[PDB]
Design a protein around this ligand. Structure first.
Ligand SMILES: Nc1ncnc2c1ncn2[C@@H]1O[C@H](COP(=O)(O)OP(=O)(O)O)[C@@H](O)[C@H]1O
Ligand SMILES: Nc1ncnc2c1ncn2[C@@H]1O[C@H](COP(=O)(O)OP(=O)(O)O)[C@@H](O)[C@H]1O
Ligand code: SF4
Ligand SMILES: [Cl-]
Ligand SMILES: [Cl-]
Ligand SMILES: [Mg+2]
Ligand SMILES: [Mg+2]
Ligand SMILES: [N+]
Lengths: 260, 268
């Protein structure tokens, strides 16, 4: 059988096609989010890779910030639930999940069943989110996808003193003007983000296993800096940005069984 | 006698030459702060315009972020003290001072002698400061000096839901694309700043007279929105951006009189 999960965030749209409730036969990410052609183009592509059509999908569930402004799905489910489901499907004994997306950072604490025990989120400040990195990458004139590997070359990381995205940009521009090494600039950028998010994590208390998901988790530099700041191993799946859409597809699989 | 006050902030450098502790004979703002060529060009303009030279100045005081790092003045004094002194010189019975500058906002509560009783400051976040306005003005393609007049024509403010400068910027850009009325976009911008600064005022407790100073107080749209948010009349001096330099020049006058009093002058 096939089920579908859609995760339409305010920054990107994520889709997964799941097989018999255990095999992803296609996944897709479009860097356009809620209220764009994001969802449309996502389906388009999944149908391509697998060669399937809407008829072939027994159940579809949508999650993320745009789930409600979207018809038609069978269920619309909280992205907190969907990320937890997807992560637990890949990584067992997960007790802390750190979701860093385009415009917010979330920390979930789970009980031994994968159910939510506690939760903290920054969604008011652009620092410590993907927007911080997106702004900086545009200032440094590289794609966000390169930052992880660029920072790997850093030998004398440049500190950013400002926690504010706006004041930090001014510091980075200044560093750029006096020819600080780009790799050292990026290293300090990664550290600013990790400092912000790790403070969130320390408030709820780290409990292993700690897993990072979200688009920003694709940035290996951020993951390293986070592991440094919280002083705990961090497990990252190979499909960090897609754990929400995976979770939604698994709730879809639940639904399909339910309609035996 | 002449004294001089210099207020070197992180955004702008301001200078005042004061005659006999009473008349401002020269004033000058240069939109470059610490540490640029800003202070030097302020001095050039004060001296140039008065034909005076360093020698004619009996005492010099420096204040602001960069007072340290400025050699040399007879004294370097807190900008809190300097704004309080300058404001009290101009506006009697002042009990609350709101200083909105390029990168922070401060609220001072003063006692009946003009002494600091309480204090709150946002200096970590660009929202609710001149930087927020500077960023938005760039986006809407208007000079920051034009914002006040534009906002006067607003009849239906376009509200900004985000408190963050970066997220708010995206909302404004969206409004511009939807061809929202510019005066209503600007009014919403002014309202965002006022909500964030007025929260400081309310925590400290408004006490009349309320005075706004700082370069952002030159934006009458910000002043109107502030008065609305705190539900109190706000007085703005003629020279809101220069009150720190004026306070410094007054402390310089105090120093000058003090040194006159450690000597006797005996004439026939
Ligand atoms: N290849 C990549 N490498 C590093 N970071 C990325 C990559 N692709 C996207 N991102 C980051 O992920 C963010 C969006 O992540 P996502 O979890 O999709 O957000 P949302 O769920 O809120 O839409 C973007 O801000 C971007 O910074
Ligand atoms: N004529 C004006 N109208 C509106 N805003 C102004 C005007 N002149 C300066 N500003 C704003 O005032 C701010 C600087 O204020 P100021 O009190 O000098 O800062 P600081 O003391 O921290 O250097 C800047 O953000 C600037 O854009
Ligand atoms: S600190 Fe900077 S990034 Fe955080 S909310 Fe304030 S303006 Fe936005
Ligand atoms: Cl200025
Ligand atoms: Cl002025
Ligand atoms: Mg998300
Ligand atoms: Mg100042
Ligand atoms: N993305």
């Amino acid at each position: 059988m096939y089920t579908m999960g859609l995760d339409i965030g305010s920054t990107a749209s994520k889709g997964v096609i799941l097989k018999n409730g255990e095999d992803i036969v296609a996944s897709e990410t479009i860097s356009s989010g809620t209220g764009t052609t994001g969802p449309s183009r996502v389906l388009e592509k999944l149908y391509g890779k697998t060669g399937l059509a809407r008829e072939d999908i027994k159940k579809v569930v949508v999650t993320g910030y745009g789930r409600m402004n979207y018809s038609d799905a069978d269920k619309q489910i909280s992205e907190l639930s969907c990320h937890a489901r997807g992560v637990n499907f890949i990584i067992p004994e997960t007790r802390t999940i750190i979701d860093i997306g385009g415009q917010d950072a979330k920390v979930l604490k789970l009980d031994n069943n994968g159910r939510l025990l506690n939760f903290l989120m920054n969604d008011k400040c652009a620092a410590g989110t993907g927007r911080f990195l997106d702004v900086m990458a545009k200032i440094i004139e590289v794609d966000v996808s390169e930052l992880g590997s660029i920072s790997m070359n850093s030998q004398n990381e440049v500190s950013i003193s400002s926690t504010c995205t706006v004041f930090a940009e001014s510091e980075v521009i200044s560093h750029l003007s006096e020819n600080a090494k780009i790799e050292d600039i990026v290293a300090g950028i990664h550290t600013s983000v990790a400092k912000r998010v790790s403070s969130l994590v320390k408030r709820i208390g780290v409990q292993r296993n700690v897993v990072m998901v979200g688009g920003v988790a694709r940035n290996s530099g951020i993951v390293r800096a986070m592991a440094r700041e919280i002083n705990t191993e961090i497990i990252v799946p190979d499909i960090p940005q897609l754990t929400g859409a995976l979770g939604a597809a698994l709730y879809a699989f639940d639904e399909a069984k339910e309609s035996q």
